[PDB]
Scaffold this motif. Sequence first.
Motif, PDB file in Angstrom:
ATOM      1  N   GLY A  23       0.758  -1.202   0.100  1.00 41.06           N
ATOM      2  CA  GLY A  23       0.123   0.160   0.068  1.00 41.06           C
ATOM      3  C   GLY A  23       0.721   1.279   0.174  1.00 41.06           C
ATOM      4  O   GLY A  23       0.590   2.286   0.827  1.00 41.06           O
ATOM      5  N   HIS A  24       1.736   1.344  -0.782  1.00 37.26           N
ATOM      6  CA  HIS A  24       2.596   2.537  -1.014  1.00 37.26           C
ATOM      7  C   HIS A  24       2.203   3.104  -2.353  1.00 37.26           C
ATOM      8  O   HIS A  24       1.789   2.643  -3.358  1.00 37.26           O
ATOM      9  CB  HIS A  24       4.180   1.996  -1.082  1.00 37.26           C
ATOM     10  N   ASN A  25       2.070   4.533  -2.323  1.00 40.51           N
ATOM     11  CA  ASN A  25       1.663   5.174  -3.286  1.00 40.51           C
ATOM     12  C   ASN A  25       2.415   5.182  -4.839  1.00 40.51           C
ATOM     13  O   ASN A  25       2.464   5.290  -5.851  1.00 40.51           O
ATOM     14  CB  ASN A  25       1.593   6.669  -2.869  1.00 40.51           C
ATOM     15  N   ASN A  26       3.822   4.820  -4.318  1.00 37.34           N
ATOM     16  CA  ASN A  26       4.761   4.744  -5.564  1.00 37.34           C
ATOM     17  C   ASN A  26       5.623   3.597  -5.445  1.00 37.34           C
ATOM     18  O   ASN A  26       5.795   2.879  -4.536  1.00 37.34           O
ATOM     19  CB  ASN A  26       5.631   5.924  -5.435  1.00 37.34           C
ATOM     20  N   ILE A  27       5.956   2.900  -6.656  1.00 38.57           N
ATOM     21  CA  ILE A  27       6.862   1.805  -6.947  1.00 38.57           C
ATOM     22  C   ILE A  27       8.069   2.517  -6.835  1.00 38.57           C
ATOM     23  O   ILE A  27       8.616   2.921  -7.705  1.00 38.57           O
ATOM     24  CB  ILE A  27       6.832   1.299  -8.276  1.00 38.57           C
ATOM     25  N   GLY A  28       8.956   2.047  -5.722  1.00 41.25           N
ATOM     26  CA  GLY A  28      10.331   2.800  -5.604  1.00 41.25           C
ATOM     27  C   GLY A  28      11.204   1.628  -5.710  1.00 41.25           C
ATOM     28  O   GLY A  28      11.051   0.572  -6.037  1.00 41.25           O
ATOM     29  N   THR A  29      12.526   2.074  -5.451  1.00 41.03           N
ATOM     30  CA  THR A  29      13.563   1.262  -5.709  1.00 41.03           C
ATOM     31  C   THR A  29      13.461   0.060  -4.789  1.00 41.03           C
ATOM     32  O   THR A  29      13.766  -1.361  -5.140  1.00 41.03           O
ATOM     33  CB  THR A  29      14.937   1.738  -5.623  1.00 41.03           C
ATOM     34  N   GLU A  30      13.053   0.170  -3.687  1.00 46.56           N
ATOM     35  CA  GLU A  30      12.668  -0.990  -2.770  1.00 46.56           C
ATOM     36  C   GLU A  30      11.614  -1.919  -3.239  1.00 46.56           C
ATOM     37  O   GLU A  30      11.815  -3.172  -2.986  1.00 46.56           O
ATOM     38  CB  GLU A  30      12.264  -0.467  -1.275  1.00 46.56           C
ATOM     39  N   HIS A  31      10.794  -1.657  -4.027  1.00 43.95           N
ATOM     40  CA  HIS A  31       9.732  -2.335  -4.677  1.00 43.95           C
ATOM     41  C   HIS A  31      10.358  -3.157  -5.771  1.00 43.95           C
ATOM     42  O   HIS A  31      10.099  -4.452  -5.971  1.00 43.95           O
ATOM     43  CB  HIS A  31       8.451  -1.680  -5.136  1.00 43.95           C
ATOM     44  N   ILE A  32      11.242  -2.557  -6.519  1.00 39.78           N
ATOM     45  CA  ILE A  32      12.134  -3.197  -7.657  1.00 39.78           C
ATOM     46  C   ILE A  32      12.817  -4.229  -6.883  1.00 39.78           C
ATOM     47  O   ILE A  32      12.975  -5.424  -7.317  1.00 39.78           O
ATOM     48  CB  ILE A  32      13.206  -2.132  -8.332  1.00 39.78           C
ATOM     49  N   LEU A  33      13.605  -3.987  -5.976  1.00 45.98           N
ATOM     50  CA  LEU A  33      14.448  -4.895  -5.044  1.00 45.98           C
ATOM     51  C   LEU A  33      13.529  -5.892  -4.591  1.00 45.98           C
ATOM     52  O   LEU A  33      14.045  -7.301  -4.628  1.00 45.98           O
ATOM     53  CB  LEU A  33      14.963  -4.196  -3.724  1.00 45.98           C
ATOM     54  N   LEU A  34      12.551  -5.784  -4.140  1.00 43.56           N
ATOM     55  CA  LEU A  34      11.353  -6.880  -3.656  1.00 43.56           C
ATOM     56  C   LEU A  34      11.159  -7.890  -5.180  1.00 43.56           C
ATOM     57  O   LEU A  34      11.060  -9.015  -4.883  1.00 43.56           O
ATOM     58  CB  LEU A  34      10.190  -6.459  -3.165  1.00 43.56           C
ATOM     59  N   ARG A  68       3.828   0.346   6.357  1.00 46.14           N
ATOM     60  CA  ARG A  68       2.818  -0.025   5.470  1.00 46.14           C
ATOM     61  C   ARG A  68       1.934   1.265   4.787  1.00 46.14           C
ATOM     62  O   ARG A  68       2.599   2.173   4.629  1.00 46.14           O
ATOM     63  CB  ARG A  68       1.804  -0.933   6.139  1.00 46.14           C
ATOM     64  N   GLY A  69       0.613   1.059   4.156  1.00 48.63           N
ATOM     65  CA  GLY A  69      -0.060   0.082   4.713  1.00 48.63           C
ATOM     66  C   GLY A  69      -1.517   0.535   4.434  1.00 48.63           C
ATOM     67  O   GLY A  69      -2.678  -0.223   3.875  1.00 48.63           O
ATOM     68  N   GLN A  70      -1.383   2.093   4.274  1.00 53.23           N
ATOM     69  CA  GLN A  70      -2.902   2.749   3.807  1.00 53.23           C
ATOM     70  C   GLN A  70      -2.833   2.297   2.066  1.00 53.23           C
ATOM     71  O   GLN A  70      -2.063   3.110   1.484  1.00 53.23           O
ATOM     72  CB  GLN A  70      -2.474   3.941   3.770  1.00 53.23           C
ATOM     73  N   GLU A  71      -3.338   1.266   1.827  1.00 54.40           N
ATOM     74  CA  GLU A  71      -3.276   0.737   0.491  1.00 54.40           C
ATOM     75  C   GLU A  71      -3.951   1.416  -0.708  1.00 54.40           C
ATOM     76  O   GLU A  71      -3.093   1.464  -1.634  1.00 54.40           O
ATOM     77  CB  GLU A  71      -3.946  -0.872   0.339  1.00 54.40           C
ATOM     78  N   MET A  72      -4.847   2.119  -0.775  1.00 57.13           N
ATOM     79  CA  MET A  72      -5.512   2.618  -1.714  1.00 57.13           C
ATOM     80  C   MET A  72      -5.544   1.896  -2.946  1.00 57.13           C
ATOM     81  O   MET A  72      -5.960   0.620  -2.707  1.00 57.13           O
ATOM     82  CB  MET A  72      -4.801   4.070  -1.926  1.00 57.13           C
ATOM     83  N   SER A  73      -5.131   2.396  -3.987  1.00 56.59           N
ATOM     84  CA  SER A  73      -5.111   1.635  -5.335  1.00 56.59           C
ATOM     85  C   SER A  73      -4.828   2.497  -6.415  1.00 56.59           C
ATOM     86  O   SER A  73      -3.917   2.043  -7.317  1.00 56.59           O
ATOM     87  CB  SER A  73      -6.298   0.810  -5.582  1.00 56.59           C
TER      88      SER A  73
END
Length: 140
Positions: A23-34, A68-73
């Motif tokens: 539930g992150h507003n952006n795809i950041g490098t951490e997400h790329i890492l994941l 987290r966690g406030q997912e939105m979409s």
Amino acid sequence: FGRFTERAQKVLALAQEEALRLGHNNIGTEHILLGLVREGEGIAAKALQALGLGSEKIQKEVESLIGRGQEMSQTIHYTPRAKKVIELSMDEARKLGHSYVGTEHILLGLIREGEGVAARVLNNLGVSLNKARQQVLQLL
């Protein structure tokens, strides 16, 4: 922008899922890492698990930084750093003789760019960007 191996595409897809699901507003490098480690089969994933970084270690660290966690979409976008990492990845591919960005190249780019969350996560988890680059290269 450029072309991605199926696996790289999955890495980026997973990055988006991870971003959305954490539930992150952006795809950041951490997400790329994941995404890189989650994809599971690419050199990036292999390099990461060789570095001792499972999805969980990373997952936990990432959440420890971004919570987290406030997912939105509402369709999220890449953070500037992630965009750069993805640009860099193209260069990493090019430099390794490829016209397609593969996972190794997204990882290498993420490592080259080496700033931002993913990088801090690697650091926080005791992996220097150079050890990480080293491992990817070894695997190539």
